[PDB]
Amino acid sequence: MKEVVIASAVRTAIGSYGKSLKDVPAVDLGATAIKEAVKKAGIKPEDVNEVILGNVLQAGLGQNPARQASFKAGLPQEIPAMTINKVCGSGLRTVSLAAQIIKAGDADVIIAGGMENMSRAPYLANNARWGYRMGNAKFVDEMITDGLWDAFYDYHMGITAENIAERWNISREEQDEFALASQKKAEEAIKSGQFKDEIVPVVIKGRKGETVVDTDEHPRFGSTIEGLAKLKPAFKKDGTVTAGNASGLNDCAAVLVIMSAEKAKELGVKPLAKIVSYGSAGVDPKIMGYGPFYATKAAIEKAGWTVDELDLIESNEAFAAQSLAVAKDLKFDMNKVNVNGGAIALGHPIGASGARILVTLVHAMQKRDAKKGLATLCIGGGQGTAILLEKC
Amino acid sequence: MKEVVIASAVRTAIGSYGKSLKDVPAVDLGATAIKEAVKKAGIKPEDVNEVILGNVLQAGLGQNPARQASFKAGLPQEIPAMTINKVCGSGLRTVSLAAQIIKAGDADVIIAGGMENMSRAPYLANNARWGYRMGNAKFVDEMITDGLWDAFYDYHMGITAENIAERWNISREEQDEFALASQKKAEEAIKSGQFKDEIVPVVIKGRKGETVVDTDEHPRFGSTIEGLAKLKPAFKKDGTVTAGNASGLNDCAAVLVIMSAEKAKELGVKPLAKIVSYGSAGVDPKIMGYGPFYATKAAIEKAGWTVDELDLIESNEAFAAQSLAVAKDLKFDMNKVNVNGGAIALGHPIGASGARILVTLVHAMQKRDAKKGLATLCIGGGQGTAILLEKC
Amino acid sequence: MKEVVIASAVRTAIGSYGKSLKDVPAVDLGATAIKEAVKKAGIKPEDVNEVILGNVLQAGLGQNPARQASFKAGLPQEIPAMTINKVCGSGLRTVSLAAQIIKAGDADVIIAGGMENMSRAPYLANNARWGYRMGNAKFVDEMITDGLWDAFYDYHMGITAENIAERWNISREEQDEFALASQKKAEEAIKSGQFKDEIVPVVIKGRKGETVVDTDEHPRFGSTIEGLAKLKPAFKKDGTVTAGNASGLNDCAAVLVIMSAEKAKELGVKPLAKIVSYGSAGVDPKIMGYGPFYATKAAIEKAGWTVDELDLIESNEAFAAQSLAVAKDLKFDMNKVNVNGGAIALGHPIGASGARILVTLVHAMQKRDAKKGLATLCIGGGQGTAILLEKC
Amino acid sequence: MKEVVIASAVRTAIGSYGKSLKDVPAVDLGATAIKEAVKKAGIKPEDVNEVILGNVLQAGLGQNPARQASFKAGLPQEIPAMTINKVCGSGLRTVSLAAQIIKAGDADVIIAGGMENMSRAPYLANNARWGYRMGNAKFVDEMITDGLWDAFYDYHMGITAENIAERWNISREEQDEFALASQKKAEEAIKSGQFKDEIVPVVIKGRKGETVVDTDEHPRFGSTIEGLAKLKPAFKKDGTVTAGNASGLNDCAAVLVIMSAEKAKELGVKPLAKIVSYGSAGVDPKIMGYGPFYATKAAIEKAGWTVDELDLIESNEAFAAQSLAVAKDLKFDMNKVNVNGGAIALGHPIGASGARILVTLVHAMQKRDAKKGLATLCIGGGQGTAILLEKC
């Protein structure tokens, strides 16, 4: 089939829950990013054949958020758009989906990625329409229900991390060390300017003030192992998982311009990387965190690669426990994993995370002259997704 | 480029607003349709590569409704699933998306379709999380907001219909005649058993009983022109659009098994039709209903067909005004359109409609010397999608 | 010490939950009752010194519901109004409060009574103002919370009834016989016209019609012991209390004009009865239903009367269990109690009940050689109030 | 009739909206105050015959808030309690109501006053019980609807202040000067310890911390006339009323122990003051602010006093405009009005305000050796209430 490339890859900074981006709707984050990704790719809005964006907390956002972001970004109305929901994997899945549409021969240029604003998720009244009749009811946290709660087992994603901790025998201490290393790498990457190429600033203008947001705010600078060790278990009594060793609730948008190699050549675009392969897989939801094992395996096999051939690795850090389990089984060289930091420090804006880690991977591969790169993440409901890139 | 075929095409009865399916979650309707579609295809669940389902009012449904439908159908958990939101076109787009993935070489068997339960849509409190602070606020109807309201023009889909009516000068009388023809064809189709093959009964587990739902309930048997003429305009004072000539709010699921011709020959599947081509298009959101014009023209062009050559046509009746305009412009033979009734009579469960009309198309084609078929529909946000089918 | 009399006593029909009065706000019911009570007293609105009305579910009713009732009745705005909340006893306490103010020398004419519309009670979001932050929360049923739940013991009023049943060993069978006697007396009373004098018809303004409500609708005509024996316990597994032997949720307004005997002689008013004495008492909230025992004993003591001397008794039937216990302890002649049915049959609109039973008492007294009457009721929170009447 | 006295008068500090007392329910404020008022009066809880407390935003507070405060304060369950709602006048009305019950001969010692927590008022869904059916609805601010919105004219209390400003021709400049003087007197009274006798501290203990609240937080220290003059109109375009010249949204509880003079003598209590007279009056709701004119007039006439005989005056400052109108018509000596400051600086916790200003008056009369004192306030819905005290 046609060769498929990434022409540009941009993301907004990742905001903290109810913090810096609390006033900026996901679709506005998405438009900011699309607009910058088009410019960076050096193509006209007119060259785009489709918009495919991830978004998980769609409640009250209005019809087709992806279509909304496309408009607000200045893209012509002629361009079709859809919104994808593969939970945590939505942002990454849109990129492989774009590669597939291109391969099928139906498009040359597709805007892919994801967007999410966890801070602005509504609460819900499920029986308002026909009435509650009598008795107290649940006022629902839509962010937990739609993005973080297992539909089948009736418990938080955090409990699937505990399940992995027990089954793979991953201690609280191990988990804390992993979390601390994530913090340290993020602080260094941030203070040394490693995300400057990737981040597109967000301008929020109020009745009087204008405020620019361009720095990832989730990371806790000067984190310590004693700091992590004092934390209480977040999800269960005597649990190993904490706020410290698990990723947070976050707001972000990350977008990539995807093109066929021939069309890039035509338009004078220098590609950042080729998409070599990808895959998705399902697992028992109670161990959803291990989804990347099978997705990474499938993708690597198709590629003809070996894990040891990989130069850089982005494995999303939803929970220390699942990332450790996955990293051990796949036999990762930890030195090549999440070099600029991971979700424990940077955050987890669900619909956009899979796109976020691929945007981070591509730019790191550029700056480090790394040739082969993997991006993979686990997905609530027991799924996994992955992509392999080879630098141009 | 592999040929893509439809192995089976199933749907539940279409429930009316707050009625027969009001207690059946969308994911359960999807699960019922999925189970029956796999059986009708005569395949093994473990040959299914992916589940791709349409669903628009995802609010409070939990993580990955497509995934829930898959799991509650008893499909193996190894199979990945994703939810698609393209509003009205979602159920049809999953089918074209499935063809694209097979054409890309990444799968041989995919479950596509859509599901929707409008009766169960919640209400939202958008500022519940960080507070309303002071002052009255909106208790939001999520069904309207995410399904039926334009995000850009801030008005109901009905006004997009009034816009086409005004622009094309389509009279109330014309609209009413079209609605009557839809109601007549639907009543005849239901009474003579035309939907018997396509519909999968839904069993509802009562407190100390069981009830079966297997009949479309939206149609108003015995509709008359005089009774339609008496209706007051629905969306605008002195408008032409009414409850009578516009589709309703409905609950349904429609699923199809999609396969490569090659895998179908290997499993000895007897395909219902070949997917010859497809298309999506974006238009001014203000005239969203005219989306099928460009989407249909694109697909037909790819096919090398003409409107003349079509034997059966399914054009969704979101509104009589937009259906009339599309039909006049595309020059359809009305005798070939919506032969068993359309959405004015049958209903419009948004996530599932694009799939529902494909189901209805393929089954109508099996009962006639109908070689060529077209399925097309308009999409809130200013889009259109279409598929062309050829009987096997 | 001036003598205090009742000049008139009126009430609306008692509506059942979500039925006939569901569209009539409590303040409108109050306004209807106020208007008729003033006319029946034959006084001029400008001789009224104060409005004092019972109302418990005030949530969202707007400022000063008593004031709204007064204004919508067409009473002069110069008249002050206040709303009283003593739960179940509110409507009766306004009457005693009125006697106290007249006895103090501060007024000659006061409108007293109560109003309630349980069908219209809202639901609440208690943390909407400053935010829920995260997590599912309760969507609160205000009717239950403000009207039927104990603030101290955290359980339903029904459990206070089970507590009395267990403590006094009042059997389900006893409770059921009492409920049947209430239903029988109510059916006979309604059919033979006993409530014709007391009830003021409520006119409801439909979309293109008018409907009149003038008949109590809670009673179940044709009630049988077998049908009551078959009911499942309402509040406790294996409990004695059921929907059958406990009162319902209802809508009503009951108003009385109260005057000094001296002002009545000056305006030539022919009084229905003299208020001889009254009492309120507090008890353990866990046995709230026994409040009438102490309240009745106190009032009787002040009067210099005995239970023997009473000719007619109105003891509110919030629950058969508590009515039985109060009656046994006070040694009532059951033939003299609730002669036209009680609240098991007629209903329990909380704000208005204490007033309703006074209305019913005075009108029953006018039809018999009933010289001495007692009105008493139990109050959630562990209280009782009582009034003693003597015919004029 | 019997002579009636105030034995003790305590209040919590007044908290600012969503500030210092946001975590302390009204009933808890009320209990803190009752407990201190009993101690200060030098009587046992056992000597109290009834609890009568004002509270306006009762929504979701559970049955009989007054009964709840009485319990939480340690008062025996035998003591009856009720909650009064006369809007702004509720707190003051309970005191005169107590005087009347005592005069009627039914009690010797009554706990009177009011309580309110505006910060904790819920939001409401009025059609949750039977359903909204379809369409956006209002998520209601219960604090505005129940305490600050005119039921009849459909506008904020602020608009009734504007109405007074226009009719009496009170300028924005006049209003600002009045507001500035209120701020200045409050700051001086606070910094000089004038409220030390009256305030009972509130201890809030969290999971870890304990925080004491004992200082009125509403006042803006160092206020200036330029500060006031820059403020925008709060309620209408080109309006005279601002946030600066109108009182705020506040939390407080104020309680008084009321006794007959004979019972005080019996128990060895030294009274703070005698209640000489009181009255309530109704006005056109559109000019509710002028209610104190007629209530003050009635009370003074009964007393046999003259305005010039008054030594101290507490006229509640809901709006500068209404207080100026009232003060002009009643010909007040401004030097004797709100000496320690008024509601513009101190706040307006509705159910408790009328009690708050009487607690302030009594203590000031003590410290200043003032002999005659007036307390009066306007009431939403067009009412007014007043009391006259003579020092013991």
Numbering used by the authors:
A (entry chain A), B (entry chain B), C (entry chain B), D (entry chain A): 1 to 392
Cite, word for word, the article reporting this structure.
Here, we present the crystal structure of C. acetobutylicum thiolase (CaTHL), a type II biosynthetic thiolase that catalyses the first step of n-butanol biosynthesis and condenses two acetyl-CoAs to acetoacetyl-CoA. We reveal that CaTHL, unlike other type II biosynthetic thiolases from aerobic bacteria, is regulated via modulation of a redox-switch, indicating that n-butanol production and the relevant metabolic fluxes in Clostridium are tightly regulated by thiolase. CaTHL consists of three domains: an N-terminal α/β domain (N-domain, residues 1–119 and 249–269), a loop domain (L-domain, residues 120–248), and a C-terminal α/β domain (C-domain, residues 270–392). The N- and C-domains form a typical five-layered fold (α–β–α–β–α) observed in other thiolase superfamily of proteins including peroxisomal degradative thiolase from Saccharomyces cerevisiae, β-ketoacyl synthase II from E. coli, and the biosynthetic thiolase from Zoogloea ramigera (ZrTHL)14151617181920.
On the basis of the finding that the instability of RDR confers the redox-switch regulatory mechanism to CaTHL, a CaTHL mutant CaTHLV77Q/N153Y/A286K was generated by introducing residues that might be able to form hydrogen bonds with their neighbours and subsequently increase the stability of the CaTHL RDR. Unlike the wild-type CaTHL, the activity of the H2O2-treated CaTHLV77Q/N153Y/A286K mutant could not be recovered by the addition of a reducing agent as similarly found for EcTHL and ZrTHL. To confirm the reason for this, the crystal structure of the CaTHLV77Q/N153Y/A286K mutant was determined at 2.3 Å resolution; it was structurally confirmed that there were the change of regulatory mechanism and the stability of RDR in the CaTHLV77Q/N153Y/A286K mutant. As expected, a disulfide bond formation was not observed between the catalytic cysteine residues in the CaTHLV77Q/N153Y/A286K mutant and the RDR was found to be tightly ordered, forming a sheet–turn–helix conformation even without the addition of a reducing agent. More interestingly, the mutated residues, V77Q, N153Y and A286K, were positioned to form hydrogen bonds with each other. These hydrogen bonds seem to contribute to the well-ordered conformation of the RDR in the CaTHLV77Q/N153Y/A286K mutant. When the thlCaV77Q/N153Y/A286K gene was overexpressed in the thlA-knockdown mutant under the control of its native promoter, n-butanol concentration (7.4 g l−1) was higher than that (4.5 g l−1) obtained with the thlA-knockdown mutant complemented with the thlCa.
